[PDB]
Design a binder for these strands. Structure first.
Ligand SMILES: [Mg+2]
Ligand SMILES: [Mg+2]
Ligand SMILES: [Mg+2]
Ligand SMILES: [Mg+2]
Ligand SMILES: [Mg+2]
Ligand SMILES: [Mg+2]
Ligand SMILES: [Mg+2]
Ligand SMILES: [Mg+2]
Ligand SMILES: [Mg+2]
Ligand SMILES: [Mg+2]
Ligand SMILES: [Mg+2]
Ligand SMILES: [Mg+2]
Ligand SMILES: [Mg+2]
Ligand SMILES: [Mg+2]
Ligand SMILES: [Mg+2]
Ligand SMILES: [Mg+2]
Ligand SMILES: [Mg+2]
Ligand SMILES: [Mg+2]
Ligand SMILES: [Mg+2]
Ligand SMILES: [Mg+2]
Ligand SMILES: [Mg+2]
Ligand SMILES: [Mg+2]
Ligand SMILES: [Mg+2]
Ligand SMILES: [Mg+2]
Ligand SMILES: [Mg+2]
Ligand SMILES: [Mg+2]
Ligand SMILES: [Mg+2]
Ligand SMILES: [Mg+2]
Ligand SMILES: [Mg+2]
Ligand SMILES: [Mg+2]
Ligand SMILES: [Mg+2]
Ligand SMILES: [Mg+2]
Ligand SMILES: [Mg+2]
Ligand SMILES: [Mg+2]
Ligand SMILES: [Mg+2]
Ligand SMILES: [Mg+2]
Ligand SMILES: [Mg+2]
Ligand SMILES: [Mg+2]
Ligand SMILES: [Mg+2]
Ligand SMILES: [Mg+2]
Ligand SMILES: [Mg+2]
Lengths: 33, 294, 169, 159, 139
RNA sequence: AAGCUCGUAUCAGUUUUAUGAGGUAAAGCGAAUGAUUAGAGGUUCCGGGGUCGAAAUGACCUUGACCUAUUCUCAAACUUUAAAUAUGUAAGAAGUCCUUGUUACUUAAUUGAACGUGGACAUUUGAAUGAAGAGCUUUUAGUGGGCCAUUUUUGGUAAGC
RNA sequence: GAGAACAGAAAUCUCCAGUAGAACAAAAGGGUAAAAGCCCCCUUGAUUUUGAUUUUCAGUGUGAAUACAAACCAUGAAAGU
RNA sequence: GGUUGCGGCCAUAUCUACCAGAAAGCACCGUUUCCCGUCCGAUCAACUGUAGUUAAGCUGGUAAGAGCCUGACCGAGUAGUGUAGUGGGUGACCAUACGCGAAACUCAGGUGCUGCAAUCU
């Protein structure tokens, strides 16, 4: 069988939450060598 | 947990009805159970309240008043010893029994009991209690399930089949009685009759005593100790309905100690609340106690 | 005091976040299906992310919930890989804890190239006896403060059994 | 263009009371309404069915009908220079027995009884209300009460 | 004030904010009086009679320089405003006596800028913690 | 205008008693929402910039950001609170109680719900004041540019706007 | 907010807090928390008959709505809707 | 008086922290043959009342606790307001006369009451 979890949320808009936003990050980041 | 509630939060917080907080009353279904056709005025809709606690079954016939709900009659599964049942006091068969008793008990003290007998045969048939043509209509009641989950085979519909078969007109349908085949869209009255007489418990006792002497002798430690054999189960229940219809009326327990007496002892384990005087006294002490930079 | 508030693993949820629909997901599911002997539930994207390549309501990941003895043994098979050492992170403020592993073959499990290699997330949630008080339909209540799981408690649970190590600050 | 919709102007009228939202309690469904009953009207905005129109808010009338989930109330509405008679169909959630009507009946019973006891002595009654009379003479005493005598207070700013 | 008697010698605070928008029509056949609603023109602070406009706190002896500082702003304000020196410690309430009693009792702890006060309301492990000096043996 | 049916009665641009409805004035903002000045303390273990062993998945720091307790100021389209003035209904004969009749409605039910028979209570028959009489029908004129004052108030710099 | 391989501000998983700060096609306002919101199961009451009523009102029309009556159906264990 | 089932009114009942709770009840709790529902007997379903425990739910007590509730010549007859004048003032505005009358503030008290039924040292 194929089973799909249900998302209790109300939101309907294909939109990333304010929890997105590319301000906040790092100049750092694990940069491979 | 450092999620402290502001006063802003606390103040504008509107509380649910008390019994809602308690997770006991579902007020959205209570409305639709209680409310009368306004042109039927003061005629009470009566509820068949059925409840299961871990060790008991509660059955009440209730109506509502502004000043509070009101019970016509109640029966309990813990009554059933008197009618000859001493084990599985919250199983399906126990329901049908307490469901029967509440039925026969009310319309006894209603005078409806001499007419409207119910079934007496009991062979797991789906049928309602049709009205004696040309005379009193059967006492009508509606199944309050409370917060019980409408599953097909639920103990709570046991008390329904016991209460219908008891003569009470209690409007219902097959599809939640044990032995409803959602594919057959049909009921097997066999399975249902079986369940009325504890047929599902008996089979298990055998299965167990045969395949697990140790476990059986634990789950049914109390049957061994009473010499109750598995296959004798049906008779216990059968002769119980018998006994029930025979004397449905309620005898209360005899009680030691006065109604008042209990009080005078009971909560002398009642933590007594302070008067303002020693309360302030309490803290004017508490200050000196802490009044120093530590 | 210490009688019945005895504290145990509530459950363990394995999570493989494949980050893309299709075969690579259906395969990672098999992996999760074999390991648990249960059927796993796939989850879907909450919203489109372009730099990730996921369309909203695309199936993306897959997870399975395990309780009791089989969880207690997959928790084991996992702590094996982590060489019985976790950090002072991994342990949340609400008594739970988890860890992650690359390649599932590091815990029993034959290779099989028809599948391939998947890493996964282990997260075990810890409660005590009596938790159904917050779970049942009727009289839904909430676990008294003195009861209920904390990071102090459930770390030094994890230490005394497993004999394992918890590192750093 | 102007706007005169059916629930216009009723942003606060059909608003719920502060910290009294959600479920309407069950007292409201247990009350029983007969014809000739006198009811106040006060819409519950959560019960969108069988609402009074906003005009009839706060008006009081008589039951001319008792249907399943509603009463019919007769309201006398002034329109132009004459009163017109209005038939309203309100669900029970927007209605309320009138207290002053219940006090009246109590006083009718009270009046019958006072009349009994009186006539069961052939004596007189006065059953009808008299308004607040003047005041008969009094003699205030001065013992413990030698009149503290007051005077006006000087001006004084304080900022 | 800052020149006659030096920067750190006072705290002058404007006690009314220009919150109320003003409009003009602006008569750009001239349009007329048709549709005469205004564009915003500038801000004004709606002020009552008796309402404080400027407040200055300073050292008890700077009084004179400070008053002259107000009677000089005054000439820049339409209408009549009084210069009133307030029997009251600083920008606090409490008329200077009363303020001092509470200082020699330890109920007043220097919060930044303004100040905090010790109540007989909260939980002691806070009231005691926040104001040690009120509940110490120290005179 | 023409009257008509009656004649103390049912009335009323009013008070009183009883009981409703309202969100304006004020008020509030260390209450919700939206604004707004200022410090103070506290988090970054998760934006950033350096200085220190270039050291820094380490500190001291200033910077934001958010957090906490405070602080100055605000709202026609904000608000817990919340007036005054206005505003609904009631104050009995078409009433009250007692007996019990009808029905196909309604009730488990001779239960109710409507509508009645028979009986009982006519001194204040159920507040005040007034009533120059109450009710009612038919038909038809002119009018359908208004303006002014106190107060409330919108537009406008304002106006005999 | 605290937590979990690749995994980053942002993917999926867990716990905790959470009076609604969300969602209910749309303007805004009201209303709603075991729901009026999210997931799911079954459905055509979006039907038939012709009257009464509320708003605007002349107490005409229109649009919209409300409460019954007589049918025929849907759903639910049911009261109900 | 305790407790339970169904309630009324819906914070004097809510929130946070910490103690306590005899007896019965309620609970947690044991089990998965059966009807039944889950990714997961966790929830839901059934079985036993048997192996266990008041640890939690629950119940009360504590707290110069947060909130909420009540009161007061606390602020205040303040703000606002109905009526009156050929009242004051250049005016904004103000006072008087017949009346009504708040909020913020301050302090003081309080922290569920209650109906039906069953049951209990
Ligand atoms: Mg969803
Ligand atoms: Mg969520
Ligand atoms: Mg406060
Ligand atoms: Mg339900
Ligand atoms: Mg009846
Ligand atoms: Mg019937
Ligand atoms: Mg089968
Ligand atoms: Mg408009
Ligand atoms: Mg409006
Ligand atoms: Mg109100
Ligand atoms: Mg609510
Ligand atoms: Mg509708
Ligand atoms: Mg324009
Ligand atoms: Mg000037
Ligand atoms: Mg307002
Ligand atoms: Mg308005
Ligand atoms: Mg205002
Ligand atoms: Mg206020
Ligand atoms: Mg604000
Ligand atoms: Mg202040
Ligand atoms: Mg103002
Ligand atoms: Mg305006
Ligand atoms: Mg306003
Ligand atoms: Mg009038
Ligand atoms: Mg004419
Ligand atoms: Mg004409
Ligand atoms: Mg004309
Ligand atoms: Mg006037
Ligand atoms: Mg669901
Ligand atoms: Mg409609
Ligand atoms: Mg099984
Ligand atoms: Mg079942
Ligand atoms: Mg279990
Ligand atoms: Mg269960
Ligand atoms: Mg409980
Ligand atoms: Mg307090
Ligand atoms: Mg004044
Ligand atoms: Mg005035
Ligand atoms: Mg004159
Ligand atoms: Mg003049
Ligand atoms: Mg004035």
């Amino acid at each position: 069988k194929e089973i799909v979890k249900s998302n209790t949320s109300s939101k309907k808009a294909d939109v990333p939450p304010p929890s997105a936003d590319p301000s906040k990050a790092r100049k750092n980041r694990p940069r491979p060598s | 947990q450092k999620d402290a509630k502001s006063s802003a939060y606390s103040s504008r917080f509107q509380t649910p009805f008390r019994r809602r907080r308690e997770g006991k009353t579902d007020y959205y279904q209570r409305k639709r159970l209680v409310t009368q056709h306004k042109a039927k005025y003061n005629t009470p809709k009566y509820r068949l309240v059925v409840r299961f606690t871990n060790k008991d079954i509660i059955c009440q016939i209730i109506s509502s008043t502004i000043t509070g709900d009101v019970v016509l009659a109640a029966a309990y599964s813990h009554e059933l010893p008197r009618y000859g049942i001493t084990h599985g006091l919250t199983n399906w068969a126990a329901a049908y029994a307490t469901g029967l008793l509440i039925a026969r008990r009310t319309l006894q003290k209603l005078g409806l009991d001499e007419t409207y007998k119910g079934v007496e045969e009991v062979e797991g048939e789906y049928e309602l209690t049709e009205a004696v043509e040309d005379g009193p209509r059967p006492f009508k009641v509606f199944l309050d399930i409370g917060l019980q989950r409408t599953t097909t085979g639920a103990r709570v519909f046991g008390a329904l089949k016991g209460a219908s078969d008891g003569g009470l007109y209690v409007p219902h349908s097959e599809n939640r009685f044990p032995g409803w085949d959602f594919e057959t869209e049909e009921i097997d009255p066999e399975l249902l009759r079986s369940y009325i007489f504890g047929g599902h418990v008996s089979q298990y006792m055998e299965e167990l005593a045969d395949d697990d002497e140790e476990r059986f002798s634990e789950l049914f430690k109390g049957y061994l100790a009473d010499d109750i054999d598995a296959d004798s189960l049906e008779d216990i229940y059968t002769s119980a309905h018998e006994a029930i219809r025979a004397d449905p009326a309620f005898k209360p327990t005899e009680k030691k100690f006065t109604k008042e007496q209990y009080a005078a002892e009971s909560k002398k384990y009642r933590q007594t609340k302070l008067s303002k005087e020693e309360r302030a006294a309490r803290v004017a002490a508490k200050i000196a106690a802490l009044a120093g930079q530590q | 005091q210490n009688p019945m508030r005895d504290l145990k693993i509530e459950k363990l949820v394995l999570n493989i976040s494949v980050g893309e629909s299709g075969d690579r997901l259906t395969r990672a599911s098999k992996v999760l299906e074999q390991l648990s002997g249960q059927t796993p539930v796939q989850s879907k994207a909450r919203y489109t992310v372009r730099t990730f390549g996921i369309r909203r309501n695309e199936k993306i990941a897959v997870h399975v919930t395990v309780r009791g003895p089989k969880a207690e043994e997959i928790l084991e098979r996992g702590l094996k890989v982590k060489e019985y050492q976790l950090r002072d992170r991994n342990f949340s403020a609400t008594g739970n804890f988890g860890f992650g592993i690359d390649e599932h073959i590091d815990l029993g499990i034959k290779y099989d190239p028809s599948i391939g290699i998947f890493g996964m997330d282990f997260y075990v949630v810890m409660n005590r006896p009596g938790a159904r008080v917050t779970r049942r339909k009727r009289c839904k209540g909430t676990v008294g403060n003195s009861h209920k799981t904390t990071k102090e408690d459930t770390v030094s649970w994890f230490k005394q059994k497993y004999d394992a190590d918890v590192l750093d600050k | 263009g102007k706007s005169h919709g059916y629930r216009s102007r009723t942003r606060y009228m059909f608003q719920r009371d502060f910290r009294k939202h959600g479920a309407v309690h069950l007292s409201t469904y247990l009350k029983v309404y007969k014809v000739g009953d006198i009811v106040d009207i006060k819409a519950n905005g959560s019960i969108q069915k069988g609402m009074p129109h906003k005009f009839y808010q706060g008006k009081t009338g008589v039951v001319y009908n008792v249907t399943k989930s509603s009463v019919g109330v007769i309201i006398n509405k002034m329109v132009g220079n004459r009163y017109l008679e209005k038939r309203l169909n309100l669900r029970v959630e927007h209605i309320k027995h009138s207290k002053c009507r219940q006090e009246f009946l109590e006083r009718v019973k009270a009046n019958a009884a006072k009349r009994a006891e009186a006539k069961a002595q052939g004596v007189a009654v006065q059953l009808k209300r008299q308004p607040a009379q003047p005041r008969e003479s009094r003699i205030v005493s001065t013992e413990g009460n030698v009149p503290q005598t007051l005077a006006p207070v000087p001006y004084e700013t304080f900022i | 004030m800052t020149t006659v008697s030096g920067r750190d010698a006072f705290h002058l605070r404007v006690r009314v904010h220009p919150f109320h928008v003003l409009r003009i029509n602006k008569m750009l056949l001239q349009q007329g009086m048709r549709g005469a609603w205004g564009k915003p023109h500038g801000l004004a602070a709606r002020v009552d009679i008796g309402q404080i406009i400027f407040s200055v706190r300073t050292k008890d002896s700077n009084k004179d320089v400070v008053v002259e500082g107000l009677r000089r702003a005054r000439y820049k304000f339409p209408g009549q405003q009084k210069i009133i020196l307030s029997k009251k410690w600083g920008f606090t309430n409490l008329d200077r006596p009363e303020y001092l009693k509470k200082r020699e009792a330890g109920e007043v702890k220097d919060d930044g800028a303004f100040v905090k006060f010790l109540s007989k309301k909260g939980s002691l492990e806070n009231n005691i913690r926040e104001f040690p000096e009120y509940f110490a043996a120290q005179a």
